[PDB]
Amino acid sequence: IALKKENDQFLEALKLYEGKQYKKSLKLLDAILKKDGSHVDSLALKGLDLYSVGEKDDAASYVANAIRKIESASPICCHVLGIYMRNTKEYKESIKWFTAALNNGSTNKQIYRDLATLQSQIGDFKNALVSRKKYWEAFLGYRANWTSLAVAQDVNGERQQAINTLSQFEKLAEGKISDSEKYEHSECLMYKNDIMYKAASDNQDKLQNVLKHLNDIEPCVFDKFGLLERKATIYMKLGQLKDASIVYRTLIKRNPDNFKYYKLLEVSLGIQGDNKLKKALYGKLEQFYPRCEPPKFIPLTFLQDKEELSKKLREYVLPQLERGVPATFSNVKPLYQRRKSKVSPLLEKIVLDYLSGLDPTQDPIPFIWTNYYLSQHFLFLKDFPKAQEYIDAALDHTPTLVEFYILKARILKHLGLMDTAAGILEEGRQLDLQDRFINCKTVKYFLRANNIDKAVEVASLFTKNDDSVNGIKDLHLVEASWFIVEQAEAYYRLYLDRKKKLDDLASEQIANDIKENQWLVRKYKGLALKRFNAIPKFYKQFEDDQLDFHSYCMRKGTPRAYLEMLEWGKALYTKPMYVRAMKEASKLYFQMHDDRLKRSQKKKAKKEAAAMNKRKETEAKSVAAYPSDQDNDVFGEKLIETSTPMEDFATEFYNNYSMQVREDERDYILDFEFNYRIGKLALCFASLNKFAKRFGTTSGLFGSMAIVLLHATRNDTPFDPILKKVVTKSLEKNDINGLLFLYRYRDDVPIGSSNLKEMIISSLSPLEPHSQNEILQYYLYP
Amino acid sequence: PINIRRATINDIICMQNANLHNLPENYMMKYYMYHILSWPEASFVATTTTLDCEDGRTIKLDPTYLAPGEKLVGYVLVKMNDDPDQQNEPPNGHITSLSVMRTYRRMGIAENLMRQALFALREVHQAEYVSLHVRQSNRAALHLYRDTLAFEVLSIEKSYYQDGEDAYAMKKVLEEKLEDDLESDLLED
Numbered sequence A: 001i002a003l004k005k006e007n008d009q010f011l012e013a014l015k016l017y018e019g020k021q022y023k024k025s026l027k028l029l030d031a032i033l034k035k036d037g038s039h040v041d042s043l044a045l046k047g048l049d050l051y052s053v054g055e056k057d058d059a060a061s062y063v064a065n066a067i068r069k070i071e072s073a074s075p076i077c078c079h080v081l082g083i084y085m086r087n088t089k090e091y092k093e094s095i096k097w098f099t100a101a102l103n104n105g106s107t108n109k110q111i112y113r114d115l116a117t118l119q120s121q122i123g124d125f126k127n128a129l130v131s132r133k134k135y136w137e138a139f140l141g142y143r144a145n146w147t148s149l150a151v152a153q154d155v156n157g158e159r160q161q162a163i164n165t166l167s168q169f170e171k172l173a174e175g176k177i178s179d180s181e182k183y184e185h186s187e188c189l190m191y192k193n194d195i196m197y198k199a200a201s202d203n204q205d206k207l208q209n210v211l212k213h214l215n216d217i218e219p220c221v222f223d224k225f226g227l228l229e230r231k232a233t234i235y236m237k238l239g240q241l242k243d244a245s246i247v248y249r250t251l252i253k254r255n256p257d258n259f260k261y262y263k264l265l266e267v268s269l270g271i272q273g274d275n276k277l278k279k280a281l282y283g284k285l286e287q288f289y290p291r292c293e294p295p296k297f298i299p300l301t302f303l304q305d306k307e308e309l310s311k312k313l314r315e316y317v318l319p320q321l322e323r324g325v326p327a328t329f330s331n332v333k334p335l336y337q338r339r340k341s342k343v344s345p346l347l348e349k350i351v352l353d354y355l356s357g358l359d360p361t362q363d364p365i366p367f368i369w370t371n372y373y374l375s376q377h378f379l380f381l382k383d384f385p386k387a388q389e390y391i392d393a394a395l396d397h398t399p400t401l402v403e404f405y406i407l408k409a410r411i412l413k414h415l416g417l418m419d420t421a422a423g424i425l426e427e428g429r430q431l432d433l434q435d436r437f438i439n440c441k442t443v444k445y446f447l448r449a450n451n452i453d454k455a456v457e458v459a460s461l462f463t464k465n466d467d468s469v470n471g472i473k474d475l476h477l478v479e480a481s482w483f484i485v486e487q488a489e490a491y492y493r494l495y496l497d498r499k500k501k502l503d504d505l506a507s508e509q510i511a512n513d514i515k516e517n518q519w520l521v522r523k524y525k526g527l528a529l530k531r532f533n534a535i536p537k538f539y540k541q542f543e544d545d546q547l548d549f550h551s552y553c554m555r556k557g558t559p560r561a562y563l564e565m566l567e568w569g570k571a572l573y574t575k576p577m578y579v580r581a582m583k584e585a586s587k588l589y590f591q592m593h594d595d596r597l598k599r600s601q602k603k604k605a606k607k608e609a610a611a612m613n614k615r616k617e618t619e620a621k622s623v624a625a626y627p628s629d630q631d632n633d634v635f636g637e638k639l640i641e642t643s644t645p646m647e648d649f650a651t652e653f654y655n656n657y658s659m660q661v662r663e664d665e666r667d668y669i670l671d672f673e674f675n676y677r678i679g680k681l682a683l684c685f686a687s688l689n690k691f692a693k694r695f696g697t698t699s700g701l702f703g704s705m706a707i708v709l710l711h712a713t714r715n716d717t718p719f720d721p722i723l724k725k726v727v728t729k730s731l732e733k734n735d736i737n738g739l740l741f742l743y744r745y746r747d748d749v750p751i752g753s754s755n756l757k758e759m760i761i762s763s764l765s766p767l768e769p770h771s772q773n774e775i776l777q778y779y780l781y782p
Numbered sequence B: 001p002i003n004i005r006r007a008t009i010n011d012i013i014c015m016q017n018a019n020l021h022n023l024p025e026n027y028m029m030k031y032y033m034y035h036i037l038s039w040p041e042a043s044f045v046a047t048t049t050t051l052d053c054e055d056g057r058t059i060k061l062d063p064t065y066l067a068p069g070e071k072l073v074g075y076v077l078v079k080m081n082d083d084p085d086q087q088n089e090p091p092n093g094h095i096t097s098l099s100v101m102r103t104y105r106r107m108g109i110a111e112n113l114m115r116q117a118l119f120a121l122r123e124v125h126q127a128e129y130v131s132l133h134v135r136q137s138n139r140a141a142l143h144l145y146r147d148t149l150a151f152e153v154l155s156i157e158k159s160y161y162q163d164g165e166d167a168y169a170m171k172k173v174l175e176e177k178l179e180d181d182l183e184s185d186l187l188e189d
C-alpha cells in the first residue's frame, strides 16, 4: 500500500498551495504525476496551481482532464475544483463542486460560507439561506454569521426570522460590546429597526412599536441621520405631523443644504399648496440659514406674484453675478425649464438692467460674468446671435477664462459646427493645461467632430501610458465610459462617412483608393461595435465586483448598505451609459442582420501586402483596447463578421437589460425593432400596444410602428402569428419622429422613399441646425 | 440650484465619472464600492436639482446624471483608517478624494461637503483626527483647508502624484447666533 506514500505527498502539495507557494506545490505534484499520472487529486490541484501562476490554458487542460477522468471524487478534489471555478468566474459550476465536496463526505463546514457567497452572487438566495443557516449553526461565535443569516432571511421575506436572529445576538452580547465593535452594533440595531419598519407597514400599533424600539437604540445608534429620517417618517405614517415637523427641523439644522428636508417639512406643516404660508416659512428659515439655497430658492418655484417673484429672483441672481459665480444661470436653469414663460422675461429684464449699471473698468468681475449669464440665457432660448454677442463681449474684456471658451464652443455646437467648437475648446485648453476638466471637454468635442486621433492625443496627456503609445488602454482599464461611448459613436459616424465616399466611387488610382476606403469602413464598423461592447464588459464587471461583499459587508457590519448594493446590482443594466451603448449598438446589429438577409503581380503584390500589413500593425498598436495577450481582435473583425447578429446583441446587450428594466422605463420602440427581426411578431403587437397605453394613439411614432406592423400582417411569415397579429387589430381599428421611423422601413413597407424624404426635410425647419444637419447627413442619405 | 446630501451606492458610478473628468487619480468601481459599503455614512455628494414648480422629466443618457433632472457636480469620498498596523492607533479618517466641477466654484460646495464629512467622522466613527493630500500648486485648496477649515500642513510629500508633483499632507483634530430652537412654532404674525 504505497498509496499512502503518494497521498501524503499530495497533502504536502496542498499545504504548499495553501501557503501561497505554488511553484513548490507543482514540483511535488509533477512528481506524483509521473508514477501515477491518473491521480485526480493532483491533477486538480495542479490545474489550480497552474492558474495561480498564470498558466491559464494549461490549468484548464488539467482541470478538464481531471474532470473527464472523474465522470465521483474525493472531498478535497471537489473542494479544489470549486475554487478553480470560483477563480474563473464559473459560479454555478463552483457551486456544483463545492456541493459535491459535502456530498462525498467533507467535514469542512467552512464550505458553507463559500456556497453562501456564490449562491448570493448568482441570485439564488433561497439556497444561500440554507448555507447561511448551516454555517451559522457550526459557528455561533462570530457575529458576521448572525448578520449574514438575518440578511438571507430578510431577502427571502422572512422578516420576523431576520428580526429574531438579530435580537438573539443582542441578548447574548449584552454587556460584551467592546468599543471596537460599537459600530457594527450600531449598524445592526438600525438594520433590525429597518426590518421592523418594513413589516410594520401602515399598522398604527406596529408603527408605534418601531418608534419605541428607535428610542430604545438611539444612544447606541451613531447613524443619527438615518435614525432621524426613520423617526420623521414613522411620525408621518402615524399622522403625528407636528412631531414629524420637529424631526425635519432637526434634520434641516444638521444639513440646511438638503432640499429634501425642506420639501418634506412643508407637508408636515400642511402648508404645501399654500404659497402665502410657504413664503412665510422660508422667510423665517432664511434667517436661520442665510447662506443656504433652499430658503432663498424654493420660493422661486411657487411665488405667483410677478412683483415679489421679480424681487426674489434679483436677490438670488445678482449677488451671484457680483461674486463672479459661473454657475449662476445653471442654478436657475430648472426654473427656465419648469416656469419658462413666467421666469425668463423677469430674469432677462433683471439681468439686462443690472448690466446697464455696470462699468467695465470699475466692475470687471460682475461685468464679464453678467455677459456670461446672458449668453447662456439667449442660448437656452435658442437665440444664437445674441448668445454669440454676449459671450463675445465677455471674451473681449477678459479672454483668460476657460469658461468663456466652453460656452462659445457650446453655442457653435448648437449651430451644428462641431469642428469649430472643438477648435475653440482647444484654444481654451491652453489656458489651463494642467486641468483635466477642460481637457475632457476638448476630447469630447473632437470626438463629436469625428477627429479621433486628436481626441486620443489630447486625452493621453492625462492617462497613465506605460507600455503603450496612447491612453486608450488605460481608459478601458479605468472604466471610462464617457470616453469609450463617445468614441464609439464617432467611429460609427466615420464608418458612415467613409461608406459614402466608398459609394461615391464610380485609372488604377480609383482602384487603390477603393481598397483603402474598404479597409477604413471595415475598421470603423469594427471599432464602433467593439467600443460599444466595452460598456457591457464594464458593467458585467460591476456585477462581479459584488462577490467579495457577500462576506465583507457581514464582517464589517454594514447589512443596510449591503442590501442597497444588491438593489444597485439588479439595476446595473438599466443605467444611462449602458442603455446608451445598447441602443446605439442596435443600429449596427440590426443593420448587419438586414444586410445578411438582403445581400502578374506576385512580387509587387508581396511588397504591397507587407506595406498594408505593416501599417495595420502600426494602427493596431494605436487602437488596441486590451493587453495583447487578452485580445487578438483589435479592430473588431470577428464582431462584424458574425453570422448571429441578433443573437450577439441579445447575448451581449439586450438580454441583461430586458430582464432588469422596469416597465415604466422600457423602450418599446426598441423591443418592437428587436422582435421584428427575431421573428416574434407577437411581441411586436405587445410592444406597440404597451407603448400606445403610455403615450396615446395620437403619437406619430405610434402610427409609424402601426403602419410597419400592418404591412407585417400580410403576407408574412407563418400564417398563425400573422392571423393572431391581424386579429389583434380589434383593439385599434410635423411629427418628424414619426416620418423618420417610417423611413427606417422604407424597404419593408411599400411607400415612396423619395416622397417621404421630402416630407422629413420639410419638418426640419423648426429643429435647431445641430439636430437639423444630423438627420440630413446621417439619417436620410443614399 | 445645488443640493447637498449623504451618498449612497447609487452615486458611485457618477462619482467615478466626476473623478475621471476632474482628476488624473482614478480608481476602479470596486474601490468606490469598498468605500460606500464600508463607511456608508461618511461620504457626501453635491448634485443639481429640479424641483416641481406650480406651473427634465426623464433621465438624459449622460454620464453625470444620477436621476431625472439631477446631475452630480461634486463629491467627497471618505474613509476611516483601516490599516491593521494602526488598528491599535486612535480612530482617524482620510479624505480619499474631493472633487467639484470648476464651473461650480465660488459657491462653497467643497466646504459644505467637507463640513458634513468632518462631522460624519466625528459623530459616526468618533474620529480623533482626519487627513488628506493636495497638490502644492493648489492654492485654492490650501486656502480652503487651512484658512477656512483649520487643517494644518503636516508634511510635504515629494513626488506624490503621478506627474511628479509634490503634495501637501494636511491633518486636523476633531455662541449667541440665531438658530431654530426646535420647539416653538415657525409660523406667526
Ligand SMILES: O=P(O)(O)O[C@H]1[C@H](OP(=O)(O)O)[C@@H](OP(=O)(O)O)[C@H](OP(=O)(O)O)[C@@H](OP(=O)(O)O)[C@H]1OP(=O)(O)O
Pocket: A330, A333, A406, A410, A413, A441, B060, B062, B103
Ligand atoms: O449634452 P451635451 O451635448 O454633452 O451638452 C451638455 C448639455 O448642454 P446642451 O445640451 O444644452 O448643449 C448639458 O445640458 P443638460 O442636457 O444637462 O441640461 C450641459 O449641462 P448644463 O446645461 O447644466 O450646463 C453641458 O454643459 P456643461 O458641461 O458646460 O455644464 C453640455 O455640455 P457641453 O458644454 O460640453 O456641450
